[PDB]
C-alpha cells in the first residue's frame, strides 16, 4: 500500500503530467510494463510504492517534489528503487588516462595536508599567505593597542 | 609529547639548549676552554604532589604559614612579584592597624559604647568570622589575605579568655608550586622571609606582654583596652621597619658564588681568601638549583654587582640567607639522587647500542579518587563556603576509574612507542636527519590544566624558542615559568645520572663577565656519535644536557610518582573554603546516542544525572578537576594518534610487499587493543549504566512505534559493539578526561582499521 | 552530539556456506494457517 | 547523499534561478567545476552537500534562507562551506575598519597565526614562499659546499 501522506501529493502530480501530454503515458506504460491506458497506471501507482517511484523518474518536471516526499516516508524502497532505475554514465575516452597525470600531483598535496592538518586547514592556511600584506600590519597594530 | 632531533638542537630544541639559557644564540659551545671540576650533591625542589589543607581558624599568627601565602600568591598571579605586595601591605597596615580610629570602631562594634564592662562575666565571646565581617566594612582592601592576617592578629592580642570564642575556623588548600626555583622565585623567597620577620614581631612577646598585664586584672575600659592595644600594634610595627633588598641580597650572594665556581677568578676575587667564614659557602657551593638560577641572573641582568661589604657583612647575610631558603620557601633541600628518581628512560635500539629514537618519560601511577563537592552559603556574597562531600558519587566515579587506572598506566605507553619506532625505521639511523629524541611530561602538562592554559602553547615555544608578547603579563609568566620548568627538570636529571660535570666560562666579543655552562663527561661504548660531538677516545664531552641523556643506558623509574587526593572529607565539612570555584568544574553532561534499526531511525538522549542513577537533577554539585588524570589520558591520545600517522606514512614509503604486511599487521593489532580498552571501559558501572539506559530508551521508544523486533537486533555482531563503544567514549567525556572532538576522531581510527567488523565477539564484565 | 558515523561504515568478514540456499527468505511473513472445521 | 528534507528546498531554488537568467552558469563552473550543461550541475547538487552549499550562496536572490536550512540539516558542511567561500575585503582608508566587515578575516589570520607560531613567524613564513625559487637553490648549494 502507498502511504496516504505521499499519495495525497503523488496522484494529482502524475495525473497532471498525463493531462499535459499523452507522449509520457506510452513511455511509463513501457517502463513500468503496465497497460497503456492512463486509468491503469494510476491504479498501479496506488498499489505499489516501487511502481510509484519509477513513474516519478519518468517525469521529473513537475514530479520531483512528490518523489522526494515519497522517499522520506519510505526508506524501504529507497534501496530497491535506486537499483531498478539506473543509467550508465557515458565516460569520456580521454578521462582515465587524463587522470593518470595527476598521480604525481595529488601525492604532493597529501604531503602538504598531513603536515598542516585536515584538508580544511590547508585551504585556510593557503589563503592566509595569499592574503594581502596590510592585514598582517593591521593585526599587529591591534596588539599594539592591547587587543588580542 | 615533545619531539626533537638531537643532531640539530639549534633548530628544534633551541629553548631547551643550554646555549640559549646563557644567551649565546649564534653558535654551539666548544668543549675546549678552562675547566673547573665540581660536585653537585644537593638541590632545591618544591615537592611533587604536595596537596594539603591548612586550617586558619583561631590559634596564633603562626609566623611561617602566613608568609607562604604571600609567596603562593605573588607567584600564582604575576603582579610584578612581591615588592609591591609587601609595601602595599605596609600601606594598608599604616592605613588601618597603625591608625587607632579603626581599632576603637571594632570595640564599639563588639561590646557597646562608652561603658564599663567586666571580663568574661559581662563580656561575651564572639566568633572570629564576625570581626572579619567588620574588617571588610572598615578596611576597603584588595586582597582577602590582608584581612585574614589582620584577623588572626586581633584574635590573638585581645584574648585573655576575651572577646573571641574557640570554635570558629577557616581552611585553605596547599597548591602545586613551580618545582625548581626560577631566579625571581629566589627574590620572593627572600622577601617572603622578610615578612615573617614582620609577623613574628606581631606575634612577639612584646606584643604578648600587653596581654601579660591584662590576664588576671580583667578588662574594664573600652578605650583603655583599645587604645592600650592600638599603640601595641604600632610599637610592634616601629620595630619591624626595615629589611634587606632581595634584589640585592640574591644578586650579590649568587655573584660571590659565581666567582667561586667559574674557572677564571683572578687570585684576589675568590671567596675563601677574602671571606671570614667558609662554612656558609661550602653548603651552597655544591647546590645545583642555584646554578641554573645563576644562569638566569646573568642572562637577564647582563651584569653582576655586589654592593655588600666584602667579608664581615657578606658573612652575616649568607647565614641568614641559608635560613630563608631553608624553611620559609616550599623549596626544601634534597640529595640530588632522590629528587628526579621518578623520571625514566627507554631507547629504540638497532645494533651496537646506537639509538634510533630514545624516549624519556615521567612515571605515574594513575590517581583515581574523585570527590564531588557542592557549595553551601550561610552568608551573602562571601567567597567562604561550607562544601558538602557527597559519598557514593565518589564511589560511582571511583568504581569507574578503578579499571581505567589499570590500562592507562604511563609505563605501558612507552613500551608501546618503542615498539613503533622499531617497526617504522627499517634503515640506518645516521640518515633521516640523525637520531631523534621524544619526551613528554604529564607533570608539566598538569601545570597548564590547573591554570586552564593550553599545554600546546609552551611546546610550540621551545622549537621556536621565543615567546609572543601579545598576551597579557600574567600569561607571559605562566608561559615563561613553564618554559623554564622543563629546562630545569632536564638538567636536574642529566646531572643525576652523570655525576661528573665541569664548569666553563663563555666567550663573546664585548664587555661581558660571561656565563657559566656545565660540560658533562660521559663515557659509553658507541663507535658512532649522536648529536655532534667527537665520541673519540672512548668518552665524550658535551655542553648540551640532552645529548648527555642519549648516551645513558636504559633506566627504570625508581619510584612511582603518586598523587595524594586533596582530602575534603576531613576538614571541609565544618569549615569555610578558599577560592574553590575555578579548581573544580560544573557537573553536567549532555549527549545523545543514535542507531538505525530495520531502516528506521531511533534516538536516545542521555543526561548526567541519570547515568549515575541519581533521580534528582542536581546542578548544585560540581566535580573537582583531576588534572593528573586528564594529563595522562590527554597524552595517551596524543601519542596514539601520532602512531597511526607515522605507520600509514611509513607504509606508503616502503614500496615493498614483505614490509607492508608488517605494518598492516601493526595498525590492526593496535586497533583491536584499542577497541578492547574502550569496551572494557564500557563494562565499568558508569559504563554499564550508559548501556542499559541507551537500549532501554530505544526499546520503549520502539514499542510505541509498534514493533518489537529490537530485542533480537540490538544484540548482534555490530550494534552491540557500536553502543558498547559509544558508552565507553561517553564516560570519558562525561568526566573531564577527554574532549568531545578528540573522541570523535578517535572513532575514525576504528572506522578505517576495520577492527570492528573483524572481531564479532563481546566480553561482559557484569 | 557524539558522532558514531565513522564507526558505522564497516564490512563483515565474508564466508561461503557449504550448501547454498535460503537466500531470498531473509524477510517474509506467511500469514497464519487455519484449523479444520469442527463437528 | 543529500538529505531529502533540504533537497526540496534547494532544487527549486537553484532551478528557478537558472531559468531566471542563463548568466548563473558562470558561478557553477568557476568554483564547483561542474560540467557546462544545466542538467549535470543539478546532479552535482543532489550528489554532494558541499557542492550544494556552493550553489546556494552563489545565487543570492532567493537563496539565503534555503542555504541556512541546508546548514542545520547537514551540520558537517558548516566548516567546509563557510571556509570554501571567502572573499577578501580589500582595504579601508579610515582607521576604523573594525570587525564590521573585516571580522571574518582577522579571525582567519589568527588560526594561521596560532598554527605557525608568533605573529612574526607567519609573516616570515609568508615571505619565504614569496621569495624567488632561485634563493632556495642558493641555500641548497651553499649547503652542498658544506657551509651552514
Short mmCIF file of N, CA and C in Angstrom, two decimals, chain B residues 575-713:
data_model
loop_
_atom_site.label_atom_id
_atom_site.label_comp_id
_atom_site.label_asym_id
_atom_site.label_seq_id
_atom_site.Cartn_x
_atom_site.Cartn_y
_atom_site.Cartn_z
N UNK B 575 33.89 23.69 57.95
CA UNK B 575 34.74 24.86 57.79
C UNK B 575 34.58 25.55 56.43
N UNK B 576 34.71 26.88 56.39
CA UNK B 576 34.69 27.63 55.13
C UNK B 576 35.86 27.31 54.21
N UNK B 577 35.73 27.67 52.95
CA UNK B 577 36.74 27.34 51.96
C UNK B 577 37.34 28.53 51.23
N UNK B 578 38.44 28.25 50.53
CA UNK B 578 39.20 29.21 49.74
C UNK B 578 38.62 29.39 48.33
N UNK B 579 39.47 29.82 47.38
CA UNK B 579 38.87 30.02 46.05
C UNK B 579 38.69 28.69 45.34
N UNK B 580 37.73 27.92 45.85
CA UNK B 580 37.36 26.64 45.29
C UNK B 580 36.91 26.74 43.84
N UNK B 581 36.26 27.85 43.50
CA UNK B 581 35.45 27.94 42.30
C UNK B 581 36.11 27.40 41.04
N UNK B 582 37.32 27.86 40.76
CA UNK B 582 37.95 27.50 39.50
C UNK B 582 38.61 26.13 39.53
N UNK B 583 39.06 25.73 40.71
CA UNK B 583 39.81 24.49 40.87
C UNK B 583 38.98 23.28 40.49
N UNK B 584 37.66 23.46 40.44
CA UNK B 584 36.76 22.38 40.08
C UNK B 584 35.86 22.83 38.96
N UNK B 585 35.16 21.90 38.33
CA UNK B 585 34.25 22.28 37.27
C UNK B 585 32.84 21.76 37.48
N UNK B 586 31.90 22.44 36.85
CA UNK B 586 30.48 22.14 37.00
C UNK B 586 30.17 20.76 36.49
N UNK B 587 29.12 20.16 37.03
CA UNK B 587 28.78 18.81 36.62
C UNK B 587 27.53 18.78 35.77
N UNK B 588 27.73 18.65 34.47
CA UNK B 588 26.64 18.41 33.54
C UNK B 588 27.20 17.69 32.33
N UNK B 589 26.46 16.74 31.80
CA UNK B 589 26.88 16.09 30.58
C UNK B 589 25.67 15.83 29.71
N UNK B 590 25.68 16.39 28.50
CA UNK B 590 24.53 16.29 27.63
C UNK B 590 24.93 15.63 26.33
N UNK B 591 24.45 14.42 26.09
CA UNK B 591 24.89 13.65 24.93
C UNK B 591 23.80 12.70 24.44
N UNK B 592 23.77 12.47 23.13
CA UNK B 592 22.68 11.69 22.55
C UNK B 592 23.14 10.60 21.59
N UNK B 593 22.87 9.36 21.94
CA UNK B 593 23.19 8.23 21.07
C UNK B 593 22.15 8.05 19.98
N UNK B 594 22.55 7.44 18.87
CA UNK B 594 21.61 7.17 17.79
C UNK B 594 21.94 5.87 17.11
N UNK B 595 20.92 5.21 16.57
CA UNK B 595 21.14 3.99 15.81
C UNK B 595 19.98 3.79 14.86
N UNK B 596 20.19 3.03 13.80
CA UNK B 596 19.14 2.79 12.83
C UNK B 596 18.82 1.31 12.76
N UNK B 597 17.55 0.98 13.00
CA UNK B 597 17.12 -0.41 13.07
C UNK B 597 15.96 -0.68 12.12
N UNK B 598 16.09 -1.72 11.31
CA UNK B 598 15.07 -2.08 10.32
C UNK B 598 14.75 -0.85 9.48
N UNK B 599 15.80 -0.12 9.13
CA UNK B 599 15.69 1.03 8.26
C UNK B 599 14.77 2.10 8.90
N UNK B 600 14.83 2.20 10.22
CA UNK B 600 14.05 3.19 10.98
C UNK B 600 14.92 3.86 12.01
N UNK B 601 15.08 5.18 11.92
CA UNK B 601 15.99 5.90 12.80
C UNK B 601 15.49 6.09 14.22
N UNK B 602 16.34 5.82 15.19
CA UNK B 602 15.98 5.94 16.60
C UNK B 602 17.00 6.78 17.34
N UNK B 603 16.56 7.46 18.38
CA UNK B 603 17.45 8.35 19.12
C UNK B 603 17.16 8.30 20.60
N UNK B 604 18.19 8.18 21.41
CA UNK B 604 18.02 8.30 22.85
C UNK B 604 19.01 9.29 23.41
N UNK B 605 18.52 10.42 23.88
CA UNK B 605 19.39 11.38 24.54
C UNK B 605 19.60 10.94 25.97
N UNK B 606 20.73 11.32 26.55
CA UNK B 606 21.01 10.95 27.93
C UNK B 606 21.71 12.09 28.65
N UNK B 607 21.36 12.29 29.91
CA UNK B 607 21.95 13.38 30.68
C UNK B 607 22.83 12.82 31.79
N UNK B 608 23.44 13.71 32.54
CA UNK B 608 24.45 13.32 33.52
C UNK B 608 23.86 12.80 34.82
N UNK B 609 22.67 13.26 35.19
CA UNK B 609 22.12 12.91 36.49
C UNK B 609 21.52 11.52 36.47
N UNK B 610 21.11 11.07 35.30
CA UNK B 610 20.55 9.73 35.15
C UNK B 610 21.63 8.66 35.13
N UNK B 611 22.70 8.93 34.39
CA UNK B 611 23.78 7.97 34.23
C UNK B 611 24.33 7.46 35.55
N UNK B 612 24.38 8.32 36.54
CA UNK B 612 24.85 7.90 37.85
C UNK B 612 23.79 7.08 38.56
N UNK B 613 22.54 7.31 38.20
CA UNK B 613 21.45 6.68 38.91
C UNK B 613 20.88 7.58 39.99
N UNK B 614 21.13 8.88 39.85
CA UNK B 614 20.52 9.85 40.73
C UNK B 614 19.21 10.36 40.15
N UNK B 615 18.12 10.12 40.85
CA UNK B 615 16.82 10.55 40.37
C UNK B 615 16.77 12.04 40.13
N UNK B 616 17.06 12.81 41.16
CA UNK B 616 17.06 14.26 41.07
C UNK B 616 18.04 14.73 40.02
N UNK B 617 17.72 15.83 39.34
CA UNK B 617 18.72 16.52 38.56
C UNK B 617 19.28 17.63 39.44
N UNK B 618 20.54 17.48 39.81
CA UNK B 618 21.17 18.42 40.72
C UNK B 618 22.37 19.05 40.04
N UNK B 619 22.29 20.36 39.80
CA UNK B 619 23.40 21.08 39.17
C UNK B 619 24.23 21.79 40.23
N UNK B 620 23.76 21.71 41.47
CA UNK B 620 24.42 22.39 42.56
C UNK B 620 25.77 21.72 42.84
N UNK B 621 25.88 20.45 42.45
CA UNK B 621 27.12 19.70 42.63
C UNK B 621 28.11 20.03 41.54
N UNK B 622 29.39 19.85 41.86
CA UNK B 622 30.47 20.09 40.92
C UNK B 622 31.55 19.04 41.13
N UNK B 623 32.41 18.88 40.14
CA UNK B 623 33.47 17.89 40.21
C UNK B 623 34.80 18.58 40.37
N UNK B 624 35.62 18.08 41.29
CA UNK B 624 36.96 18.61 41.44
C UNK B 624 37.82 18.06 40.32
N UNK B 625 38.40 18.96 39.52
CA UNK B 625 39.13 18.54 38.32
C UNK B 625 40.35 17.73 38.67
N UNK B 626 40.43 16.51 38.13
CA UNK B 626 41.52 15.57 38.41
C UNK B 626 42.60 15.69 37.35
N UNK B 627 43.22 16.86 37.25
CA UNK B 627 44.08 17.18 36.12
C UNK B 627 45.18 16.18 35.86
N UNK B 628 45.65 15.50 36.90
CA UNK B 628 46.67 14.50 36.70
C UNK B 628 46.12 13.38 35.84
N UNK B 629 44.82 13.15 35.93
CA UNK B 629 44.18 12.13 35.13
C UNK B 629 43.92 12.65 33.73
N UNK B 630 43.57 13.92 33.63
CA UNK B 630 43.34 14.50 32.33
C UNK B 630 44.66 14.67 31.63
N UNK B 631 45.74 14.71 32.39
CA UNK B 631 47.06 14.88 31.80
C UNK B 631 47.46 13.62 31.06
N UNK B 632 47.40 12.50 31.76
CA UNK B 632 47.78 11.22 31.19
C UNK B 632 46.95 10.87 29.97
N UNK B 633 45.63 10.82 30.14
CA UNK B 633 44.76 10.42 29.05
C UNK B 633 44.85 11.40 27.89
N UNK B 634 45.25 12.63 28.15
CA UNK B 634 45.45 13.55 27.05
C UNK B 634 46.71 13.18 26.31
N UNK B 635 47.70 12.73 27.07
CA UNK B 635 48.96 12.32 26.49
C UNK B 635 48.74 11.08 25.64
N UNK B 636 48.09 10.09 26.22
CA UNK B 636 47.87 8.85 25.52
C UNK B 636 47.20 9.06 24.19
N UNK B 637 46.19 9.92 24.15
CA UNK B 637 45.55 10.23 22.90
C UNK B 637 46.45 10.99 21.95
N UNK B 638 47.44 11.70 22.49
CA UNK B 638 48.36 12.41 21.61
C UNK B 638 49.30 11.42 20.95
N UNK B 639 49.93 10.58 21.75
CA UNK B 639 50.86 9.58 21.22
C UNK B 639 50.16 8.59 20.30
N UNK B 640 49.00 8.11 20.72
CA UNK B 640 48.31 7.09 19.95
C UNK B 640 47.98 7.57 18.56
N UNK B 641 47.53 8.80 18.43
CA UNK B 641 47.21 9.28 17.11
C UNK B 641 48.50 9.51 16.35
N UNK B 642 49.55 9.90 17.06
CA UNK B 642 50.84 10.13 16.42
C UNK B 642 51.41 8.85 15.82
N UNK B 643 51.09 7.70 16.41
CA UNK B 643 51.50 6.44 15.81
C UNK B 643 50.94 6.32 14.42
N UNK B 644 49.63 6.15 14.35
CA UNK B 644 48.96 5.79 13.11
C UNK B 644 49.21 6.80 12.01
N UNK B 645 49.68 7.98 12.36
CA UNK B 645 50.06 8.94 11.34
C UNK B 645 51.37 8.50 10.72
N UNK B 646 52.27 7.93 11.52
CA UNK B 646 53.58 7.54 11.00
C UNK B 646 53.53 6.23 10.23
N UNK B 647 52.79 5.26 10.75
CA UNK B 647 52.71 3.96 10.11
C UNK B 647 52.16 4.08 8.70
N UNK B 648 50.99 4.68 8.57
CA UNK B 648 50.43 4.90 7.25
C UNK B 648 51.33 5.82 6.44
N UNK B 649 52.17 6.58 7.12
CA UNK B 649 53.19 7.34 6.43
C UNK B 649 54.37 6.44 6.09
N UNK B 650 54.69 5.52 7.00
CA UNK B 650 55.84 4.65 6.81
C UNK B 650 55.52 3.52 5.85
N UNK B 651 54.24 3.23 5.68
CA UNK B 651 53.84 2.17 4.78
C UNK B 651 54.03 2.58 3.34
N UNK B 652 53.52 3.75 3.00
CA UNK B 652 53.47 4.15 1.60
C UNK B 652 54.85 4.45 1.07
N UNK B 653 55.81 4.63 1.98
CA UNK B 653 57.19 4.83 1.58
C UNK B 653 57.82 3.54 1.11
N UNK B 654 57.64 2.48 1.89
CA UNK B 654 58.37 1.23 1.74
C UNK B 654 58.39 0.71 0.31
N UNK B 655 57.22 0.67 -0.31
CA UNK B 655 57.08 0.24 -1.69
C UNK B 655 57.67 -1.17 -1.86
N UNK B 656 57.51 -1.97 -0.81
CA UNK B 656 57.96 -3.37 -0.80
C UNK B 656 56.97 -4.23 -0.03
N UNK B 657 56.62 -5.39 -0.58
CA UNK B 657 55.49 -6.16 -0.08
C UNK B 657 55.69 -6.83 1.28
N UNK B 658 56.86 -7.40 1.52
CA UNK B 658 57.08 -8.14 2.75
C UNK B 658 56.95 -7.24 3.97
N UNK B 659 57.28 -5.96 3.80
CA UNK B 659 57.20 -4.99 4.90
C UNK B 659 55.78 -4.51 5.12
N UNK B 660 55.09 -4.19 4.04
CA UNK B 660 53.75 -3.65 4.12
C UNK B 660 52.84 -4.52 4.98
N UNK B 661 53.08 -5.82 4.99
CA UNK B 661 52.27 -6.71 5.82
C UNK B 661 52.75 -6.74 7.25
N UNK B 662 53.89 -6.13 7.54
CA UNK B 662 54.30 -6.00 8.93
C UNK B 662 53.59 -4.81 9.52
N UNK B 663 53.48 -3.76 8.71
CA UNK B 663 52.79 -2.55 9.10
C UNK B 663 51.29 -2.77 9.16
N UNK B 664 50.72 -3.32 8.10
CA UNK B 664 49.28 -3.58 8.07
C UNK B 664 48.89 -4.57 9.14
N UNK B 665 49.88 -5.21 9.74
CA UNK B 665 49.63 -6.08 10.86
C UNK B 665 49.76 -5.30 12.14
N UNK B 666 50.48 -4.19 12.08
CA UNK B 666 50.66 -3.37 13.26
C UNK B 666 49.47 -2.45 13.47
N UNK B 667 48.96 -1.87 12.40
CA UNK B 667 47.80 -1.00 12.50
C UNK B 667 46.65 -1.75 13.13
N UNK B 668 46.28 -2.86 12.51
CA UNK B 668 45.20 -3.70 13.00
C UNK B 668 45.45 -4.14 14.43
N UNK B 669 46.69 -4.47 14.75
CA UNK B 669 47.00 -5.06 16.04
C UNK B 669 46.85 -4.05 17.15
N UNK B 670 46.97 -2.77 16.81
CA UNK B 670 46.60 -1.72 17.76
C UNK B 670 45.10 -1.59 17.87
N UNK B 671 44.45 -1.44 16.72
CA UNK B 671 43.06 -1.04 16.68
C UNK B 671 42.14 -2.04 17.34
N UNK B 672 42.60 -3.26 17.58
CA UNK B 672 41.83 -4.15 18.45
C UNK B 672 42.19 -3.87 19.91
N UNK B 673 43.46 -3.66 20.20
CA UNK B 673 43.88 -3.41 21.57
C UNK B 673 43.23 -2.15 22.05
N UNK B 674 43.00 -1.23 21.13
CA UNK B 674 42.22 -0.05 21.45
C UNK B 674 40.77 -0.40 21.67
N UNK B 675 40.18 -1.07 20.70
CA UNK B 675 38.76 -1.36 20.75
C UNK B 675 38.41 -2.21 21.95
N UNK B 676 39.39 -2.89 22.51
CA UNK B 676 39.14 -3.63 23.73
C UNK B 676 39.22 -2.74 24.96
N UNK B 677 40.12 -1.76 24.96
CA UNK B 677 40.22 -0.85 26.09
C UNK B 677 38.91 -0.12 26.30
N UNK B 678 38.43 0.52 25.25
CA UNK B 678 37.17 1.23 25.31
C UNK B 678 36.02 0.34 25.76
N UNK B 679 35.88 -0.83 25.16
CA UNK B 679 34.81 -1.72 25.58
C UNK B 679 34.99 -2.18 27.01
N UNK B 680 36.22 -2.39 27.46
CA UNK B 680 36.41 -2.85 28.83
C UNK B 680 36.05 -1.76 29.81
N UNK B 681 36.11 -0.53 29.30
CA UNK B 681 35.71 0.70 29.98
C UNK B 681 34.19 0.74 30.11
N UNK B 682 33.53 0.27 29.05
CA UNK B 682 32.08 0.24 28.94
C UNK B 682 31.44 -0.62 30.00
N UNK B 683 32.10 -1.74 30.31
CA UNK B 683 31.67 -2.67 31.34
C UNK B 683 31.65 -2.01 32.72
N UNK B 684 32.46 -0.98 32.91
CA UNK B 684 32.50 -0.34 34.20
C UNK B 684 31.07 0.10 34.49
N UNK B 685 30.71 0.21 35.77
CA UNK B 685 29.34 0.52 36.15
C UNK B 685 28.84 1.81 35.52
N UNK B 686 29.68 2.84 35.47
CA UNK B 686 29.32 4.05 34.79
C UNK B 686 29.13 3.58 33.34
N UNK B 687 29.95 2.63 32.91
CA UNK B 687 29.88 2.13 31.56
C UNK B 687 28.54 1.45 31.36
N UNK B 688 28.26 0.50 32.24
CA UNK B 688 27.07 -0.32 32.15
C UNK B 688 25.83 0.55 32.13
N UNK B 689 25.73 1.44 33.10
CA UNK B 689 24.54 2.25 33.25
C UNK B 689 24.25 3.10 32.03
N UNK B 690 25.26 3.34 31.20
CA UNK B 690 25.03 4.06 29.96
C UNK B 690 24.48 3.12 28.92
N UNK B 691 24.99 1.90 28.91
CA UNK B 691 24.50 0.86 28.02
C UNK B 691 23.02 0.60 28.28
N UNK B 692 22.70 0.06 29.46
CA UNK B 692 21.34 -0.31 29.81
C UNK B 692 20.36 0.78 29.46
N UNK B 693 20.73 2.01 29.75
CA UNK B 693 19.84 3.12 29.56
C UNK B 693 19.74 3.49 28.10
N UNK B 694 20.77 3.17 27.34
CA UNK B 694 20.77 3.53 25.93
C UNK B 694 19.81 2.64 25.16
N UNK B 695 19.82 1.36 25.49
CA UNK B 695 18.93 0.41 24.85
C UNK B 695 17.52 0.60 25.35
N UNK B 696 17.37 0.61 26.67
CA UNK B 696 16.07 0.69 27.30
C UNK B 696 15.24 1.84 26.77
N UNK B 697 15.86 2.97 26.49
CA UNK B 697 15.08 4.07 25.95
C UNK B 697 14.71 3.81 24.50
N UNK B 698 15.47 2.98 23.81
CA UNK B 698 15.14 2.71 22.42
C UNK B 698 14.04 1.66 22.34
N UNK B 699 14.14 0.63 23.18
CA UNK B 699 13.09 -0.38 23.25
C UNK B 699 11.74 0.27 23.51
N UNK B 700 11.68 1.08 24.56
CA UNK B 700 10.44 1.73 24.94
C UNK B 700 10.03 2.81 23.95
N UNK B 701 11.00 3.35 23.23
CA UNK B 701 10.67 4.26 22.15
C UNK B 701 10.09 3.48 21.01
N UNK B 702 10.53 2.23 20.88
CA UNK B 702 10.15 1.43 19.73
C UNK B 702 8.77 0.83 19.94
N UNK B 703 8.51 0.33 21.14
CA UNK B 703 7.27 -0.37 21.42
C UNK B 703 6.05 0.48 21.09
N UNK B 704 6.20 1.79 21.20
CA UNK B 704 5.14 2.71 20.84
C UNK B 704 5.01 2.77 19.34
N UNK B 705 6.15 2.79 18.66
CA UNK B 705 6.16 2.77 17.21
C UNK B 705 5.52 1.48 16.71
N UNK B 706 5.42 0.49 17.60
CA UNK B 706 4.60 -0.68 17.34
C UNK B 706 5.27 -1.93 16.80
N UNK B 707 6.58 -2.04 16.96
CA UNK B 707 7.28 -3.24 16.52
C UNK B 707 8.38 -3.59 17.52
N UNK B 708 8.42 -4.84 17.94
CA UNK B 708 9.33 -5.24 19.00
C UNK B 708 10.61 -5.90 18.48
N UNK B 709 10.83 -5.90 17.17
CA UNK B 709 11.94 -6.69 16.58
C UNK B 709 13.32 -6.36 17.16
N UNK B 710 13.36 -5.28 17.93
CA UNK B 710 14.55 -4.81 18.64
C UNK B 710 15.32 -5.91 19.32
N UNK B 711 14.70 -6.52 20.33
CA UNK B 711 15.39 -7.36 21.30
C UNK B 711 16.38 -8.28 20.62
N UNK B 712 15.99 -8.81 19.47
CA UNK B 712 16.88 -9.64 18.70
C UNK B 712 17.99 -8.81 18.05
N UNK B 713 17.63 -7.64 17.53
CA UNK B 713 18.55 -6.91 16.66
C UNK B 713 19.62 -6.09 17.39
#
